[PDB]
Amino acid sequence: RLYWDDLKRKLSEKLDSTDFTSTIKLLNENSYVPREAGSQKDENLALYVENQFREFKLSKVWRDQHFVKIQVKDSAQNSVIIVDKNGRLVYLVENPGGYVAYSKAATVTGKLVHANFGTKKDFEDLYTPVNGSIVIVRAGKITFAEKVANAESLNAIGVLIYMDQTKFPIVNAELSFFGHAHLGTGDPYTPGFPSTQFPPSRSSGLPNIPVQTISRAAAEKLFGNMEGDCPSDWKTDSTCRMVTSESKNVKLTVSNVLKEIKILNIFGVIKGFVEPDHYVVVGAQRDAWGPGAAKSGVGTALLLKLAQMFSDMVLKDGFQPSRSIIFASWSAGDFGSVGATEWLEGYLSSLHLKAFTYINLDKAVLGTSNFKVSASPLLYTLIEKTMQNVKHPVTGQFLYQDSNWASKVEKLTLDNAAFPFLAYSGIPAVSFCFCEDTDYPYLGTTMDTYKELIERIPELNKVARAAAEVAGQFVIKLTHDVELNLDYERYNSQLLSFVRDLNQYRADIKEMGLSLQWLYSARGDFFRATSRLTTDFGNAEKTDRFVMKKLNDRVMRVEYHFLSPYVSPKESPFRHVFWGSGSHTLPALLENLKLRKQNNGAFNETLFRNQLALATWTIQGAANALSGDVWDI
């Protein structure tokens, strides 16, 4: 067993002589260049990664194979067409190079209406009714899946998406791009039974309208046939317009088809010396529509180098992780973390007893200016201590520069592979990156190349190196300390913050005959439960692996006990009342209640009483799950 100081030094010095850019460049070679999930090139890289793991001599390397239905574009072209309502003659504007996976295959003709980013707010602020019209929106702010849903929610009949030059200062205006519009993760077409025969989807999260990505040039050509200046508030090109002329409307034809593919998740593992049946999981997306250097290459490179380093530290330098470290190369990430989700779904309710943390490595390097982090609050302390002794690659200062960084942390979103881990599986998760206030413009394009990457970021090797150090320090701390570096006390602030918000309606809870007393008591009981647990840790003999096991297991279950037990994972997979999606999340409870100031019928008093109940029960349950022995109350 080594000292944390030595492990820190060892990791750092191994990192010093590590060549990241070579690997990123290597992954950008023609053997791997265009690696859409399931393709032979994806399969090539999968084989290469797998071989590398074998050369690193990890305890065991294996395959997690899955068959899934994705959507690819048909031999028939998707098309964007302008129609003259006079005589109904059509003019072809574009056959897009790209497409949007999970779009309804259909042909729709209507008026075209701009809706900015297609955010929920953008739609309400519209002075043009979207109903029965095709909508065009800029990429960014929110996922394609959300834009489609918001629009579909207002009865739009189709969606176009372009990259405006203000948000995406790309010289080539003919660039086409890719994404998906499945409002979830995993395979949307997952019949619980094999079939020839065709069953409907139900609560799939799939679009019922066609959605399609277009080049900025094609959008500006569409603007050429539209009227109305865009609000300066949108801060967009002067090109932009709002609505088709009276005599014209647009026709969209999407003919994407379902294809079944064989994806491979490639796994390596360094077994733990004390509790090998518990693991930290480190993963990266291996697939990409185009070259996907930043989208896929960076992550896969870090995955490979981290795997190599830790294998060397165990075999040469005497590092002895208490718990196991699993390295995961995912496929079909581009379709909604499909690879990751399929694997997660094998262990719906059991995984949280083995995996205590997931570290995502996707898009860790996109810029230089900033260091962003999204994570479970359970990892805020680990993250903080890690930023306090990792240096900025350009700047030289420690990453930790703001004592208040934790309150400004944004939550994991659906397009992040870290999301299903936290919100569906109840495993604390963290994603982080070096970046700007600007999205990396080339993501999802054929311009996401190494050359492009090394050009916007000439210090690529140093920056990737800093990204590896944070992930590496995470992984060491997590498998070295006898306690788990999961700060369960953090959820007191979260509950406090939530009740603090809720208490801004102590009046409206009166006019409904409701007391919030049982909820306050749940919050109090959780506080007590954490306090008792901290005391127990302090009074425990750190060398007694039996008592630590027992205390650590309690910590490992905190996250999962915030998954609502009162909703089916099939109907709503994202059960986490803090971080998931649906009417069972604390945020939903607040939004339903904010709709009570308006005397409009949007408020749903009944729903709220149920939400209040389920929340209280969930929180009580978590407090009770943490308290320990049934005679201690």
Binding site: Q77, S79, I82, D84, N86, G87, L89, V90, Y91, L92, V93, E94, N95, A173, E174, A217, E220, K221, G224, N225, S245, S247, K248
Partner: protein, 156 residues
């Protein structure tokens, strides 16, 4: 082989036949090309990069001149780069609008000479275009199939 021959089906479809090639010609207020992104034709030779076969640029050359287009003096027409998959599309801006008013007068005059019974759909202050697509290209859709082109009895 003579020179290109012309036919008008109704007010929505005109056609030119040049050797073994046929072209759909339309006039409407819809544009799909822009100076910024497509090919500007300053001289006839430039037409070579607008069509599958650079040598059938001839019929469009003849047609532009027959129309009254002055290569040295007039606004360059635009065309879709031959390499794009759309594909062929030559676009004349004949808007009854200030910048292109006099030129548009002229082209429409040409259209009246070439197609007796040409109907002018262009509106004052509004935008308007003359558009040519080679039959067989995706941009010609089904407009050159049996129910259209074969119904047109060619002359010239």
């Amino acid at each position: 082989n003579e020179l290109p021959s012309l036919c008008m089906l109704n007010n929505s479809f005109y056609y030119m036949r040049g050797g073994v090639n046929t072209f759909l010609i339309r006039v409407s207020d819809i544009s799909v090309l822009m100076k910024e992104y497509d090919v500007s034709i300053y001289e006839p030779e430039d037409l070579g990069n607008c069509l599958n076969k650079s040598d059938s640029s001839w019929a469009i050359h003849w047609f532009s001149n027959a129309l009254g287009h002055d290569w040295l003096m007039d606004p360059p027409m635009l065309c879709r780069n031959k390499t794009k998959k759309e594909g062929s599309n030559i676009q004349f801006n004949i808007s009854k609008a200030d910048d292109a008013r006099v030129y548009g007068k002229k082209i429409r005059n040409g259209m009246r000479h070439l197609f007796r019974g040409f109907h002018d759909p262009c509106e004052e202050g509004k935008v308007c275009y003359l558009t040519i697509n080679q039959c067989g290209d995706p941009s010609s859709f089904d407009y050159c199939g049996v129910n259209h082109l074969s119904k047109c009895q060619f002359d010239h």
